Amino acid sequence: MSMAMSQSNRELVVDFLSYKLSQKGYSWSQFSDVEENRTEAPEGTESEAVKQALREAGDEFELRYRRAFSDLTSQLHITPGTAYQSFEQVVNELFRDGVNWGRIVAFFSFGGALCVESVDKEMQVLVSRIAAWMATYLNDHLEPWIQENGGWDTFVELYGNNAAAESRKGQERLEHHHHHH
Ligand SMILES: O=C(O)c1ccc(-c2ccc(F)cc2)cc1
Ligand SMILES: Oc1cccc2c1CCCC2
DSSP, X not given: OOOOSSSTTHHHHHHHHXXXXXXXXOOSTTTSOOOOOOOSSOOOOOOOXXXXXXXXXXXXXXXXXXXXXXXXTTTXXXXXXXXXXXXXXXXXXXXXXOOOHHHHHHHHHHHHHHHHHHHHHTOOSSHHHHHHHHHHHHHTTTHXXXXXXXXXXXXXXXXXXXXXXXXXXXXXXXXXXXXXX
């Protein structure tokens, strides 16, 4: 069978996380050390698209929601006290009106960003904790809806593409300048 969603959640936040950490020069394997096997050219399949889509869509949300991304971190001061409680309270903001592709893409970058900051200063120990909170929320606290709507292939096919993907950014000028009455 295909048995999708078998383990593309725990390493889903770490995959996008490293993509944002490598941009700063923090990496991830050095976060909690952990035994480093190797992984030279295991191939595997690398046919995932949610990662690529989450990349472009990542900066996408960072442009229209400028006011919505102002009271999301201010109420998440990293400190030796709260962690999943306040975190789930903030992520719930996007997962409240109703699980949606956008609410699922933004919450993604919201977590990967919370770690990029904690690691930017000097806290590379709470990265697995935050990445784990989002890993569970997607393990069984959202997957059931990701399929009810259609599947990652939907949000990844609607935008995840090389560049064309039949864009529609106000593309209402052609129409032969005289073919729509
Ligand atoms: O598609 C949606 O419904 C949707 C609505 C809002 C947001 C969003 C994204 C980033 C924020 F900091 C706040 C809100 C994402 C998706
Ligand atoms: O569906 C969309 C259409 C336009 C922009 C964005 C999304 C979804 C998440 C990223 C931002």
